[PDB]
Design a protein around this nucleic acid. Structure first.
Lengths: 82, 89, 121, 112, 80, 100
DNA sequence: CAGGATGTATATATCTGACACGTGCCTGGAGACTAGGGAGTAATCCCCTTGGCGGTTAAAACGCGGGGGACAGCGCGTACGTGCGTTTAAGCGGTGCTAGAGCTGTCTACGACCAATTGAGCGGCCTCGGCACCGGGATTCTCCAGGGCGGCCAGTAAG
DNA sequence: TTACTGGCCGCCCTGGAGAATCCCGGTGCCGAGGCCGCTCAATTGGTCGTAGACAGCTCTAGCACCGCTTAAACGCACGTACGCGCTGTCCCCCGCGTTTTAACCGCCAAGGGGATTACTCCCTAGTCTCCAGGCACGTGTCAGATATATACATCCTG
């Protein structure tokens, strides 16, 4: 069983993204707030990802599955599996 | 023309309320869209899994992707009743 | 020196020349009526864009895509009820952007941002 | 550890080496596994201020300042690290706090 | 039909945004909204015509505009 | 006296903005991510096993979603004429998109 | 606080055009019966995730100053909304006209289907050059202490 | 009396002092790609069955125009709320050392489950035949639109 992993996304790893995004100064509350968003985005993709995995009765979530769950929501992905 | 079918439902859920000739159009245009989304997703879902034929299990899994939250619970609770009732006779 | 020009060469202006070149108390404070105008509209569903000026707007657009089109009087509606909604959504998003910027009056900055953030640019 | 009286108030420092100046050859903990202290001859390029050199001498590394920036001290500047010696720094630090504010009164008088 | 986008009036936009929820509309909107609405129709029509131009028809019927709107993501209901 | 030559507040970030946009590696640290995904899926169906790439495919999308968020919350923060982004923008830039 | 004026909401009554029901009809769906082709069911095996081990160092956490932006306050002046008066042309209702939407019938060209044939594109092996990496100078970037420069009064030259 | 230059304060760009970054010269490393069987899917040659291409025709629905009422637009006046620019204040986040930590790498393994075949079976497509539910059209009461005329509701504004 796993617990308290969301705080594993290190506070710098939030800015290291945000740099690539193109922001200069980051307030104090963003860090605790962004995890709240990313967690919402996974419970969407992962779920849709799991459902296919359950469907074909295969235990392991195939890399090809995640490309589908993304393709349904609207964020297509290129290069992984195909 | 799903309109006769829609009226039969409305007259069940509300024995007194009526429906305007434009709402039917909304619903006849609505049911067709949901049916297309589901049956369209069902076709793509069988293709990923190399299965040739759409079956009872394909539609159920096709629902839980589209309908959000509580609807997914009761719809698939409704669907399983129909198949079991149909398969009963 | 640089001299522009004269566009037209006559003193009469061709108005007198045939084959013409040119002749062939109580007041509400500001804002109080605005809100009254909203609840009078957000409660109603009637079409807002005037129809016959829209009909002539759709025809003008269709020309440079194909000539001599004929629109079913239904398919001019189905455009209007769409392009009315598109705008009402856009205006809600801009109102949000302005409430954000801490002013009340939407402005083209707000329009352009509410479109850029949508990614529909 | 050590503390270096730099002008008005001292700062936090760390003993980089321990040297007997009468020997004129210093013993330092090298940088990195633990690097054992080595007795080395005083560097000719290395300059020593007399206060450090009369008694037992030692080069220091300041905390917070980069090694390239880091420089020498006298021994009168060095009192053995003590919470009482930290307090006097803070009293001077507090005395340095309004020191910028006391100067700003002339700027307050300059603006008004 | 030289200029018809000037036909969508100032009170036309003002009425729309009033439904949207705004309170005060700055003057430069009334022109700038026309720029948006125009570039919306040029996308919806250019699709509706193509469905028409394919079926060999010469009339952009509602069953076309509903289709052109659907790809836009702006699904429309009530017409077919 | 005693000046450590500290760069001006603001020019390290721009610098490292110029350093990341140019680069392309993964930013969210790999393993502490994987232990997150395994923890999320552990909720929806217990005792799953994740193929290696299927974890990578997520992180590749989870990054390029956030980066798409910050590049769009920034436009909201520039909008109020300030520089520092703030949670009252990520609350906006997600409702403008309608994704909520 | 007190009170008129206003706008929307509320009531009663009057039509209608419109949705609900009736009735006839014919076209899609239900019954009935296969057939083989898809789907489930059993070993198996191997390769590929999960799991543990230890060094190690790249990186995360933590600490502190202060530098600069967040934010609050304020003065304001103009681009707004509001109201009136005039004035568009939008909407309604007709008359007229006709391209052209929709539907029929005929039948030819086109695509599904199949057997035999063959070479295109597949997996697997193997290699050496494009490139990641590191090192140390050379070069650029940035920050900041010292430094020429109009704006004033003081005493200037004087009608 | 008037008059106004000079002096001192006012205050930049510019060299340097670093840090960061680029250049280039090696130095291995592994996958891009070239080559080799081969097999199985594309190709070829033929038939058959019909989808639609094509031609003709029946009516709809659209276009054009137009004359009238009147509601919506438009322009002008005005007065004031607000966008905005300025100042001031302070807190909080960036910058940069230190100090702790756990990602990473590489390494070994074990057994688990996804990926083959064999087999066998049973389920839906295909087909034929009969009929009644859904559709279209007709109509006929009727709930909603519409006109008109109270009952509070908020809005200012003293």
């Amino acid at each position: 069983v796993l617990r308290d992993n969301i705080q594993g996304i290190t506070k710098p790893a939030i800015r290291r993204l945000a740099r690539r995004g193109g922001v200069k100064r980051i307030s104090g509350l963003i860090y605790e707030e962004t995890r709240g968003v990313l967690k919402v985005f996974l419970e969407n993709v992962i779920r849709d990802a799991v459902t296919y995995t359950e469907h074909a009765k295969r235990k392991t979530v195939t890399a090809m599955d995640v490309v589908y769950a993304l393709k349904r929501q609207g964020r297509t992905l290129y290069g992984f599996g195909g | 023309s799903y309109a006769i079918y829609v009226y039969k439902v409305l007259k069940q859920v509300h024995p007194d309320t009526g429906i305007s000739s434009k709402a039917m159009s909304i619903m006849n245009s609505f049911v067709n869209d949901v049916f297309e989304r589901i049956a369209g997703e069902a076709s793509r879902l069988a293709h990923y899994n190399k299965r040739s034929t759409i079956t009872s299990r394909e539609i159920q899994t096709a629902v839980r992707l589209l309908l959000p939250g509580e609807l997914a619970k009761h719809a698939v609770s409704e669907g399983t009743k129909a198949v079991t009732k149909y398969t009963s006779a | 020196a640089r001299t522009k020009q004269t566009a037209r060469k006559s003193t009469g202006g061709k108005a007198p020349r045939k084959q013409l070149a040119t002749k062939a108390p109580h007041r509400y404070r500001p804002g109080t009526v605005a809100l009254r105008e909203i609840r009078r509209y957000q409660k109603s569903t009637e079409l807002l864009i005037r129809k016959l000026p829209f009909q002539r707007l759709v025809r003008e657009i269709a020309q440079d895509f194909k000539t001599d089109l004929r629109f079913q009087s239904s398919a001019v509606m189905a455009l209007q009820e769409a392009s009315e909604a598109y705008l009402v959504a856009l205006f809600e998003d801009t109102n949000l952007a302005a409430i954000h910027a801490k002013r009340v009056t939407i402005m083209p900055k707000d329009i352009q941002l509410a479109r850029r953030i949508r990614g529909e640019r | 550890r050590c503390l270096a009286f730099h002008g008005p108030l001292m700062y936090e420092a760390k003993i980089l080496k321990i040297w007997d100046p009468s020997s004129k050859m210093y013993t330092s903990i090298p940088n990195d596994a633990t690097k054992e202290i080595k007795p080395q001859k005083l560097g000719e390029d290395e300059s020593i201020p007399e206060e450090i050199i009369n008694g037992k001498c030692f080069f220091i590394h300041y905390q917070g300042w980069k090694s390239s920036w880091d420089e020498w001290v006298g021994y009168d500047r060095i009192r053995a690290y003590n919470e009482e010696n930290i307090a006097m720094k803070k009293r001077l630090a507090n005395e340095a706090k309004e020191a910028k504010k006391s100067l700003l009164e002339q700027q307050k008088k300059k603006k008004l």
